[PDB]
Amino acid sequence: TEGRSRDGGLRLGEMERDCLIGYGASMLLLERLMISSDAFEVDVCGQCGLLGYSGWCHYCKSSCHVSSLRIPYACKLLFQELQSMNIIPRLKLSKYN
Amino acid sequence: TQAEIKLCSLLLQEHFGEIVEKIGVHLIRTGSQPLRVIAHDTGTSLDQVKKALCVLVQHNLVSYQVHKRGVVEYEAQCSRVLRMLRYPRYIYTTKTLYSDTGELIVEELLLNGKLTMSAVVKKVADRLTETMEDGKTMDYAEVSNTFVRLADTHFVQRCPSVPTTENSDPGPPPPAPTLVINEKDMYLVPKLSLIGKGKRRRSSPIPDDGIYWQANLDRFHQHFRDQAIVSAVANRMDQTSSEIVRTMLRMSEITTSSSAPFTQPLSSNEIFRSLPVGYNISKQVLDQYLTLLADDPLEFVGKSGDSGGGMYVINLHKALASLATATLESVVQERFGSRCARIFRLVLQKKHIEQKQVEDFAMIPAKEAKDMLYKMLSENFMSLQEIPKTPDHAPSRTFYLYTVNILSAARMLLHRCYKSIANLIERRQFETKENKRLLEKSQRVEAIIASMQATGAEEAQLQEIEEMITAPERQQLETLKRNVNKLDASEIQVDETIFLLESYIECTMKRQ
Amino acid sequence: LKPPPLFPDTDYKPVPLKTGEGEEYMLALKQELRETMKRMPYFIETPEERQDIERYSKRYMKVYKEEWIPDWRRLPREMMP
Amino acid sequence: ENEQVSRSQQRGLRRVRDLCRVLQLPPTFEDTAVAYYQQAYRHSGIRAARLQKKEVLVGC
Amino acid sequence: VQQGMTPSAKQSLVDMAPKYILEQFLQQELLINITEHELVPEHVVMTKEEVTELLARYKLRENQLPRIQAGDPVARYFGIKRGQVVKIIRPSETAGRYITYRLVQ
Amino acid sequence: RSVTGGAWYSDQDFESEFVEVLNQQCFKFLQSKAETARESKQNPMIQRNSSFASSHEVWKYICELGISKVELSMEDIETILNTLIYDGKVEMTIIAAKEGTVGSVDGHMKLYRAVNPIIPPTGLVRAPCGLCPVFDDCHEGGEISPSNCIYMTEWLEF
Amino acid sequence: DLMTYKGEVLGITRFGLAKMKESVLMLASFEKTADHLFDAAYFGQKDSVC
Amino acid sequence: KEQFRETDVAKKISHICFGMKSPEEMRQQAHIQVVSKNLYSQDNQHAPLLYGVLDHRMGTSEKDRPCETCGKNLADCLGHYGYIDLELPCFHVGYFRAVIGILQMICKTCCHIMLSQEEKKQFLDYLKRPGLTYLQKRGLKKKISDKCRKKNICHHCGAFNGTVKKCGLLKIIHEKYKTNKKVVDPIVSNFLQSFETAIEHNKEVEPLLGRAQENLNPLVVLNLFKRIPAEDVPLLLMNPEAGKPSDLILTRLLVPPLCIRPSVVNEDDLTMKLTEIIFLNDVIKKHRISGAKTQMIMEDWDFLQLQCALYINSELSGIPLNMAPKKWTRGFVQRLKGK
Numbered sequence A: 001t002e003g004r005s006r007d008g009g010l011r012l013g014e015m016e017r018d019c020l021i022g023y024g025a026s027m028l029l030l031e032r033l034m035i036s037s038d039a040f041e042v043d044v045c046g047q048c049g050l051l052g053y054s055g056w057c058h059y060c061k062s063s064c065h066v067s068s069l070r071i072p073y074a075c076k077l078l079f080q081e082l083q084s085m086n087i088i089p090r091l092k093l094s095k096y097n
Numbered sequence B: 001t002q003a004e005i006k007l008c009s010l011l012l013q014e015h016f017g018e019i020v021e022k023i024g025v026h027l028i029r030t031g032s033q034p035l036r037v038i039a040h041d042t043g044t045s046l047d048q049v050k051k052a053l054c055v056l057v058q059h060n061l062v063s064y065q066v067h068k069r070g071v072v073e074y075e076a077q078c079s080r081v082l083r084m085l086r087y088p089r090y091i092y093t094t095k096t097l098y099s100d101t102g103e104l105i106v107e108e109l110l111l112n113g114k115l116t117m118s119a120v121v122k123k124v125a126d127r128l129t130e131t132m133e134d135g136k137t138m139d140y141a142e143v144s145n146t147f148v149r150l151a152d153t154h155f156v157q158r159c160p161s162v163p164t165t166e167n168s169d170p171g172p173p174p175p176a177p178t179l180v181i182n183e184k185d186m187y188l189v190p191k192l193s194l195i196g197k198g199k200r201r202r203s204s205p206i207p208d209d210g211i212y213w214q215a216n217l218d219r220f221h222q223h224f225r226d227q228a229i230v231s232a233v234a235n236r237m238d239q240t241s242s243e244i245v246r247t248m249l250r251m252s253e254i255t256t257s258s259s260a261p262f263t264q265p266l267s268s269n270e271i272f273r274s275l276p277v278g279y280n281i282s283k284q285v286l287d288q289y290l291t292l293l294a295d296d297p298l299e300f301v302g303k304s305g306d307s308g309g310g311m312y313v314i315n316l317h318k319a320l321a322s323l324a325t326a327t328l329e330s331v332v333q334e335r336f337g338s339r340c341a342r343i344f345r346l347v348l349q350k351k352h353i354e355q356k357q358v359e360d361f362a363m364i365p366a367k368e369a370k371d372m373l374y375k376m377l378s379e380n381f382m383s384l385q386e387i388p389k390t391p392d393h394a395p396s397r398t399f400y401l402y403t404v405n406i407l408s409a410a411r412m413l414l415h416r417c418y419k420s421i422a423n424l425i426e427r428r429q430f431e432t433k434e435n436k437r438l439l440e441k442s443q444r445v446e447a448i449i450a451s452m453q454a455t456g457a458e459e460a461q462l463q464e465i466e467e468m469i470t471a472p473e474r475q476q477l478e479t480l481k482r483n484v485n486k487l488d489a490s491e492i493q494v495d496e497t498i499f500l501l502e503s504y505i506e507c508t509m510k511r512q
Numbered sequence C: 001l002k003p004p005p006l007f008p009d010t011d012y013k014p015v016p017l018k019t020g021e022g023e024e025y026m027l028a029l030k031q032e033l034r035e036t037m038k039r040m041p042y043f044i045e046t047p048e049e050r051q052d053i054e055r056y057s058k059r060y061m062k063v064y065k066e067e068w069i070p071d072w073r074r075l076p077r078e079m080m081p
Numbered sequence D: 001e002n003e004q005v006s007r008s009q010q011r012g013l014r015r016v017r018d019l020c021r022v023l024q025l026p027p028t029f030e031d032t033a034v035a036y037y038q039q040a041y042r043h044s045g046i047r048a049a050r051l052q053k054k055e056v057l058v059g060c
Numbered sequence E: 001v002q003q004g005m006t007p008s009a010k011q012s013l014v015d016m017a018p019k020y021i022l023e024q025f026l027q028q029e030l031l032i033n034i035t036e037h038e039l040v041p042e043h044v045v046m047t048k049e050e051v052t053e054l055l056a057r058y059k060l061r062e063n064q065l066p067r068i069q070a071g072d073p074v075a076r077y078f079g080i081k082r083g084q085v086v087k088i089i090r091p092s093e094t095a096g097r098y099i100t101y102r103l104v105q
Numbered sequence F: 001r002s003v004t005g006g007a008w009y010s011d012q013d014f015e016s017e018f019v020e021v022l023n024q025q026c027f028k029f030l031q032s033k034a035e036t037a038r039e040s041k042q043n044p045m046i047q048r049n050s051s052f053a054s055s056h057e058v059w060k061y062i063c064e065l066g067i068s069k070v071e072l073s074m075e076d077i078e079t080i081l082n083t084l085i086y087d088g089k090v091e092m093t094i095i096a097a098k099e100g101t102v103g104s105v106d107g108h109m110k111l112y113r114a115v116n117p118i119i120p121p122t123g124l125v126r127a128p129c130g131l132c133p134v135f136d137d138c139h140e141g142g143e144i145s146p147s148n149c150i151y152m153t154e155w156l157e158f
Numbered sequence G: 001d002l003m004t005y006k007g008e009v010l011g012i013t014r015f016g017l018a019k020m021k022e023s024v025l026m027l028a029s030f031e032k033t034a035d036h037l038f039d040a041a042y043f044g045q046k047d048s049v050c
Numbered sequence H: 001k002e003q004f005r006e007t008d009v010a011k012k013i014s015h016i017c018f019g020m021k022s023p024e025e026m027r028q029q030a031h032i033q034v035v036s037k038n039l040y041s042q043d044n045q046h047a048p049l050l051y052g053v054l055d056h057r058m059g060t061s062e063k064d065r066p067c068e069t070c071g072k073n074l075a076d077c078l079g080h081y082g083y084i085d086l087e088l089p090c091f092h093v094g095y096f097r098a099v100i101g102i103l104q105m106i107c108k109t110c111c112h113i114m115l116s117q118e119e120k121k122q123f124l125d126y127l128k129r130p131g132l133t134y135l136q137k138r139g140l141k142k143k144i145s146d147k148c149r150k151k152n153i154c155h156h157c158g159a160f161n162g163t164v165k166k167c168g169l170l171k172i173i174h175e176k177y178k179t180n181k182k183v184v185d186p187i188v189s190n191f192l193q194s195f196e197t198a199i200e201h202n203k204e205v206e207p208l209l210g211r212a213q214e215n216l217n218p219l220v221v222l223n224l225f226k227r228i229p230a231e232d233v234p235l236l237l238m239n240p241e242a243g244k245p246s247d248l249i250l251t252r253l254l255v256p257p258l259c260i261r262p263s264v265v266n267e268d269d270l271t272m273k274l275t276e277i278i279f280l281n282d283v284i285k286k287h288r289i290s291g292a293k294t295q296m297i298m299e300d301w302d303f304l305q306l307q308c309a310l311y312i313n314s315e316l317s318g319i320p321l322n323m324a325p326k327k328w329t330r331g332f333v334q335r336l337k338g339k
């Protein structure tokens, strides 16, 4: 949440995202902006490139192509906020190596 | 143009299998590229592509041409590809006009793509010899008679030949022979050294080497529009009008371009003698007849003069327009009923007119007629001229003037026609696939009955083979055959409209 | 409140097919010829593939196929069958 | 989720609140008065009664 | 030219004869040879074999180089056809020269 | 007339049966006269005149029947006939005013004649897709499909 | 060097930046967000996350 | 016995691939149709309706009951889509520029672009070029547009095309059959003859008919895009795999899942602004059967145009004062933009 009246923690603005870049800290920036704030986990269908739920892809009618990622919640929100606007980000997956 | 593509894809698959038509639709949706690149875009090997494109060139759905810097590309023929389902009418027409010989000729002509004179005559004779027994045979003479009758009537015509590549451009020959076409010898049959009869074959020396031939499809199309117009006048006035129209057209076959909106006028003096002797009409009565058909406000035929007897000209463009608008009126009549045809005809004649200016004419009251007009916007048959009274362009100060445009409407329906056909055909494929178990079982048991049928026959198998669950299921397959027959009948009983619509739109083209 | 069904009824009924003898003869030729043409070598099925291990029956009931004969003097240089 | 309500019925309701605003009593008097009015507007006799009987029924 | 050219003449100067080249100037620009200018370093036109040598040294493709547009004054000066490489020798505060390569588009 | 609305306007409603029976009966006579005229089968030039019907003639006939107790007017019957041409049923021709007692045009007088339909019902209207209302929404991938469409399955039977 | 390596002097502006970066998300995070996104869908851009 | 199960594979995003969706696909992706203006029942419980907006078969916005579609609570429901359909088609406001550019590019009679085959050759050469960049594609857009605006006739069909002009915000017109500064062509005769009955019934048309223009409204424009030849599409710079041109005209909309738009105060902006669209649709369908004139019909049509535009963003200007918005509102754009 936002502020001390409701115990909102403290904001790490864009201006400290920059200072953290300059040091070349790649694991601390990830830690301090994803795994502590708002990490979330999502299902993506590899065949069609849309999101799915509970290991199912209602679009394609199958449970074989789906996969589970870690993602910031704000990004999960952004995609759902774009599709209805009739702009569709389809995801293309690959191995992690 | 997704509907068209859905048609041709499944048609090429039907006629050549599921391995080739992907290539065909790629060229159809991209136009022309050399083999190196299409191999990559299709992700298919050189040999597969080659054994495909040779076939498509054979039936000339795809062409080839040498381009800049010497590369050779293959050009897809977007129309030819989807003309194929018109073959039934070619066969029907040739069997109607000519004996069965030409019928079996044309089926070979299309099935092989191209044939040389010796090849076609020999093959058609050889299959014919199976059609009678007891040493009876036919000669190449009658087959050649039929073929030349086709040739001078210009229904069957020569292929494009090669240039003199054996004595031109010495050194490294061009990548492709770059065939050439000419009219000078283009209905001229070669003299074959082969003589005699068709010979029956074991199933296990050419003078006309390379002189291939192919049917002239547009010759049929010209004939078809002639058929339509004569049928129309016969329905309207009498069969006698049909004969005289048939008369001046059979004179006008070569006197004007195939797509010209008109013809150069013949005289009633010429028609009075070109008419068959079976008609007893006299010259003065003939002249007064053509006066009526020239005075018909449908104006299929005009006078245009009186030099050397009664001058008369047929108006091809307006004849096509007449039939196309009749088709328009027909479909709206059946799709929504006659009162819709009334209101449509109102605006058709009253080119601009408002709703409060037609309710009297249409004599259908409010709260149903106005809505009836609005639904017609959903199929884009109407338009509204919305002329404004003020520079404000405010809706409170404009006139809502209805309008109709023929070409826009016809162009639209063509998609509906195509998707109708596609749905019907893919429906048949759907049932056939889902019934494949029944079909395989029925074919198996039919083969079992075919075994021992008369040779080595015995009674222990003439009732047991249909005893099982196929007994109530054979009628399901027979009903399936009725469904196949119904939808197939729809295939033939759809595209006559397509012929007239397409002819009208293509003749609308000025090509500046 | 209750959204309409998938298939609403229709007041008009499509016109029944017309019957014709020459035309019926055509439709007959139709389902004949469409099965006949698929035997002509221009038609291509999948090339023979994926056979488990050699057993001599494919020596006696072997399939016979030979390369086609297009016109070698009409198509570009790379045409050799 | 506010129903359109009969035109005469809401006309009466307006009299309800225009009455209670005279004495300018605390608001809950208005709302509960409206509730009682709606409860009374559920019978045939009152609906068919002449408007003068309606003008009095808001008062009571 | 003295005072410029007509639009038709300006148009023709791009397609008159692909077999011929007709670089254009006004006396205005030739009152001084820009190579004598302080603000511009030395250029050299670079040769295909050395092109291969350089892009072998760094393991690049030529689309991965910096750029110089054809219309640029020195580009006009040497009349270089696009698709070539020019060596730039940047002077430094010391004896160390700064060498750098730039591709013409 | 904007207040009386003629004989067709009745009790703030419209006598649909009255105008529809007029339409059907007037074409009944128009086609009857056309067929009887053509049964003469002598010369098309005389059929050019004999096939057409006079508006006064048919008005006299239809008022002789007296189907409607309300009066049938001259221009009324003419406008009733005027619906059939836009119904695609009749033709129109104008001649000199000496025909009939009225001569309903200034120095002229105009006739009607039944017309054959130019073409049979098309093949397209025999296809169920032509009549299908969800045409826009039917797709092989869509939940409404040719592999699922009820109209087609039911159209198999009759 | 950044301002001039593209063969042209490129200002550090909303216009200048559009001519230096190809990716979609980054620009949409600086300025002209709506127009970038809409037209980006029109062109069918793939956008490698790098 | 059991079949081997691939439990989990570590996966990393390679690309984000943007694109549009066609209404057919749009139906395929959603879960339920929503057909009701209202959102709660009339009874005391404040329960939500079964086919209106805010139906919990699309998501959750509270702690005490699950989403029916996936039977889990607000903690982990990923939300699911519905859809609505419009009686008359509509411009997207976003892609409005694209619509007008396409209309300017194509021939209005035959749907073929007005290019000579040499121009097509050059331009497809540029397309094959490796390493096409956004700047470069913008460049081909510029050069295409320039070489095509200066052309007047159509090579393919033999006709000639006017120009497209704005006729008020979010509607467009075309300069086809007006009176021409080059003096009118003989086709003016059939123009004049076409208003004969209009003038006979309404003489005030005659002074006005010389100002007529081509009435390409959204419906007829949509019918036009259904017909572009497959060959031309790439030359419009649209990636044919991203979307066909018909998607620029919309006949269905997605309702976003509840988790985008929670509801406790208990309003939320999109949840109500969307109720107005479904309201107006019900009106025009009721109005569809009324016997009303053409006038108020097209008003109630274009009022959808105003509403959809305000659904995407609220800062439109060309809105007259009598139906100008009464207050500030948060469309989609307002919640993506800003600090």
Ligand code: SF4
Pocket (backbone or CB within 6 Å): B423, B424, F128, F129, F130, F132, F133, F134, F135, F138, F139, F144, F145, F146, F149, F150, F151, F152
């Ligand atoms: S549902 Fe059947 S009849 Fe209707 S369009 Fe689809 S295939 Fe044709």
Ligand SMILES: [Zn+2]
Pocket (backbone or CB within 6 Å): A045, A046, A047, A048, A049, A050, A057, A059, A060, A061
């Ligand atoms: Zn999927």
Ligand SMILES: [Zn+2]
Pocket (backbone or CB within 6 Å): H058, H059, H067, H068, H069, H070, H071, H072, H077, H078, H079, H080
């Ligand atoms: Zn859920």
Ligand SMILES: [Zn+2]
Pocket (backbone or CB within 6 Å): H107, H108, H109, H110, H111, H112, H154, H155, H156, H157, H158, H159
């Ligand atoms: Zn055109």
